């Protein structure tokens, strides 16, 4: 649980993506939520001003405000404010979802995708299973750390990481029980970098190796942080007096969910 | 993720319990799983001997072995072993559920409950809102740390902890349960205590269900679960004289643990 020093705003995005085995993009879906936590009663009569760069009328984002949040102010001035102007936000450090968005992209469209994937598989020789290569390319401006790939098999023989065919970031099997099967973690994917993970794994037939799932999460704590889609806070202001700014912090995050190759 | 030195055995229990506001037990349900992780191929042809103290024929537990685990051996000798004796456990540090159990208890029966609860509520007379008292009594032999009580309201005003009647309790962010959450630092083994605060709500019934959240774990070869599940040894499947190195973690976690 991140610490809240008064106001803490969390901009959380979750990305779903699906790839064919050769890396062709099938679909993607980004969901986002802006959560507000307040633990100081003196800061509870506040409004959030979203960044001027955000187009709040972009219908492809299906912006939806919470029932208690004034939709008309959001749409008019990019302001998050209560619908009843005489009330204040709960201030006992509850996570308050105030705004949500969702966007989808279709086949062959990479606009929502932070990490592209391709796979190559062949029957191995010099063990009993398949030689897999997972190729990846990041378009993020920051590093992804601890990226986990899960293959849905439970082999009788240990996985053999093919260190020479894979990257020179390092790979190792790890326990990861959020996904079913055998999981391999890569330490880092540098900003904007392309790499490969190569291993041999036992499976009864090629199609058993799929869906391969990837699991990753990054966050930044910084007042000026912008989410993957560009969501960001410009300021936080007294609800009465929009010239009076208040202290606050912002965490942004991007997490995979259904991010697979099939 | 706990570190595995070769063999790591996790004994995990989850407890549900429901109380009336006056503390009368309505019901409870305990669910357990024994998970095996193996990360050394040399240790994959292993069998687990459960503690001799476990009655594996107690039907009120509905002990169920994983399809790939030999039921007969479990029943006969309290052994966890593969049904197909020519196979081995997966050994790439995957969590393998090998045994489960489940037990229920009815109204007024505290045998599955680690923490009993009673509540008292009345309008506050010194400030806005309701004065709540939550009384608790542990029957555990170890301390519970960081126990979280959640009240399903979102008050305008800060919660006032009535430090006189509880001292250390504090509001925390806990989004696994909806509402306002207060954490108590410790509940000593076998101790009884109380949490007392004042909170705003529109009417008394809005303060319910109150939910409690707790989780404790221990790492020790000889650790026993809340219901007594434990490991005696780990042994080579082909030679039950040849013991193997291992560790055990036990845990107990609340799930639907409330007063209503």
């Amino acid at each position: 649980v991140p610490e809240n020093n008064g106001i803490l705003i969390s901009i959380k995005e979750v990305i779903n993506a699906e790839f064919s085995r050769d890396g062709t993009i099938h679909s993607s879906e980004l969901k986002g939520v802006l959560e507000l936590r307040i633990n100081d009663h003196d800061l509870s009569h506040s409004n959030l001003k979203l960044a001027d760069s955000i187009d709040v009328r972009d219908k492809s984002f299906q912006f939806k405000t919470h029932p208690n949040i004034d939709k008309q102010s959001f749409l008019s001035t990019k302001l998050i404010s209560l619908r009843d102007k005489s009330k204040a936000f709960p201030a006992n450090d509850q996570s308050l979802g105030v705004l949500r968005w969702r966007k989808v992209a279709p086949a062959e469209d990479d606009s929502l995708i932070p990490l592209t994937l391709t796979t190559a598989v062949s029957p191995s020789e010099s063990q009993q299973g398949f030689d897999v290569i997972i190729e990846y390319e990041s378009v993020l401006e920051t590093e992804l750390a601890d990226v986990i790939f899960t293959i849905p098999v439970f082999p009788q023989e240990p996985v053999d990481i093919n260190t020479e065919s894979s990257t020179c970031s390092d790979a190792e099997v790890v326990n990861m029980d959020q996904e079913m099967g055998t999981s391999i973690k890569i330490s880092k994917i540098a900003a904007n970098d392309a790499g490969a993970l190569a291993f041999t794994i036992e499976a009864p037939y090629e199609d058993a190796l799929y869906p391969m799932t990837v699991s990753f999460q990054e966050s930044t704590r910084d007042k000026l942080a912008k989410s993957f889609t560009g969501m960001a806070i410009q300021s936080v202001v007294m609800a009465n007096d929009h010239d009076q700014e208040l202290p606050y912090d912002v965490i942004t995050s991007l997490k995979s969910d259904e991010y697979l190759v099939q | 993720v706990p570190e595995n030195n070769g063999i790591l055995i996790s004994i995990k229990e989850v407890i549900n319990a429901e109380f009336s506001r006056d503390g009368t037990i309505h019901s409870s349900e305990l669910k357990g799983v024994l998970e095996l992780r193996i990360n050394d191929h040399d240790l994959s042809h292993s069998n687990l001997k459960l503690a001799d103290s476990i009655d594996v024929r107690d039907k009120s537990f509905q002990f169920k072995t994983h399809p790939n685990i030999d039921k007969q051996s479990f029943l006969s000798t309290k052994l966890i072993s593969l049904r197909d004796k020519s196979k081995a456990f997966p050994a790439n540090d995957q969590s393998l559920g090998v045994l489960r159990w489940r037990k229920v208890a009815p109204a007024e029966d505290d045998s599955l409950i680690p923490l009993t609860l009673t509540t008292a509520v009345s309008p506050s007379e010194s400030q806005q809102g309701f004065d709540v008292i939550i009384e608790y009594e542990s029957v555990l032999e170890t301390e519970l740390a960081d126990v979280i009580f959640t009240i399903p309201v979102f008050p305008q005003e800060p919660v006032d902890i009535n430090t006189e009647s509880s001292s250390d309790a504090e509001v925390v962010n806990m989004d696994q349960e909806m509402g306002t959450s207060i954490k108590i630092s410790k509940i000593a083994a076998n101790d009884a205590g109380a949490l007392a605060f004042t909170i705003e709500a529109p009417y008394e019934d809005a303060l319910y269900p109150m939910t409690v959240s707790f989780q404790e774990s221990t790492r020790d070869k000889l650790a026993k679960s809340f219901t007594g599940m434990a490991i005696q040894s780990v042994v080579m499947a082909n030679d039950h004289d040849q013991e193997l190195p291992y560790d055990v973690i036990t845990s107990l976690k609340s799930d639907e643990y409330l007063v209503q």
Binding site: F154 | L82, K87, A88, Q94, S95, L96, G97
Partner: peptide, 6 residues
């Protein structure tokens, strides 16, 4: 977990 195989 409970869907693993041999």
């Amino acid at each position: 977990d409970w869907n693993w195989e041999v």
